[PDB]
UniProtKB/TrEMBL annotation:
Pfam families: Glu_cyclase_2. The keyword Calcium applies. This is Glutamine cyclotransferase. The keyword Calcium applies. InterPro entries: QCT, Quino_amine_DH_bsu. Disulfide bonds join 169-247.
Length: 250
């Protein structure tokens, strides 16, 4: 299954937020982890305005990565480290750390019980948020190909959607066996933004799922907008290798 996305709503997103983690909490409150050394943060963000309502400015040495919210705690990984940070969502104080056993800290998501982690390999890791042991590694594959570059993750309805870094695709990955359930192609978002003059926006990255209202939000790094998107199943035939080219970059 391949989906395209329709933007239902655009919201401002801090165009300087190098989004590496995107969480929808509730009531139009997002949490975001931004990367870049010196700019990494965990943020509480108002969906409607993209206003940063609360920010934990990370140490300059960290490059904020995936973020998810689990049991009122934000779990964040960081780039080129196996350390994770846990923040109380209310104050964004780093209350606890963890380590994970991924190769890197890219994305995080949660099904509300466990953490899913990505490290940019094709492994979607299930991480126990108590022990921070790996529960399971899903080797995400599509058409025999590793779906590497699983980046920002979002658990949505039993699936973990993963931005695929440097694509405008999101992989829908079965939380059951890492099956690539579907590809979401979102080239329109970046393209339109670039058309609007946001020419140096970085990659699509950041998926947040609002289970309460059933809203998918996606944004990207340094994107000035965050998009509520609706997926539409592509019903037409997709060229062979299309996904491999666009989502797997070969
Ligand atoms: C999460 O993990 C980070 C990274 O290790 C912790 O921050 C680090 O905490 C170290 C232990 O306190 C800090 O090193 C100490 O610094 C002081 C001042 O120079 C020295 O006196 C002492 O001997 C240690 O060297 C280290 O600086 C700090 N690293 C960074 C990049 O901030 C973090 O600890 C928590 O946050 C930091 C910012 C401090 O407030 C710590 O006291 C606090 O524990 C770990 N978080 C948790 C909740 O464990
Ligand atoms: Zn997310």
């Amino acid at each position: 299954r391949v989906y395209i996305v329709e933007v239902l709503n655009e919201f401002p997103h801090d165009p300087y937020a190098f989004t590496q983690g995107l969480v929808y909490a509730e009531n139009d409150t997002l949490f975001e982890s931004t990367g870049l050394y010196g700019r990494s943060s965990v943020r509480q963000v108002a969906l409607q305005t993209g206003k940063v309502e609360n920010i934990h400015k990370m140490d300059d040495s960290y490059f904020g990565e995936g973020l998810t919210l689990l049991n009122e705690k934000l779990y964040q990984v960081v780039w080129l480290k196996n350390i994770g940070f846990i923040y109380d969502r209310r104050t964004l104080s780093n209350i606890k750390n963890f380590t994970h056993q991924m190769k890197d800290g890219w994305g995080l998501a949660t099904d509300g019980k466990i953490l899913y982690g990505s490290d940019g390999t094709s492994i979607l890791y299930e991480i126990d948020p108590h022990t921070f042991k790996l529960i399971k590694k899903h080797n995400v594959k599509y058409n025999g190909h590793r779906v590497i570059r699983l980046n920002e993750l979002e658990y949505i309805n039993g699936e973990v959607w993963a931005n695929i870094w440097q694509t405008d695709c999101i992989a829908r990955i079965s939380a059951k066996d890492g099956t690539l359930l579907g590809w979401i192609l979102l080239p329109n978002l970046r393209k339109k933004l670039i058309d609007e003059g946001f020419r140096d926006i970085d990659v699509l990255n950041g998926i947040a799922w609002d289970q309460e209202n059933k809203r998918i939000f996606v944004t990207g790094k340094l994107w000035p907008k965050l998009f509520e998107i609706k997926l539409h199943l592509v019903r037409h035939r997709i060229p062979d290798g299309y996904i491999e080219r666009h989502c797997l970059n070969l």
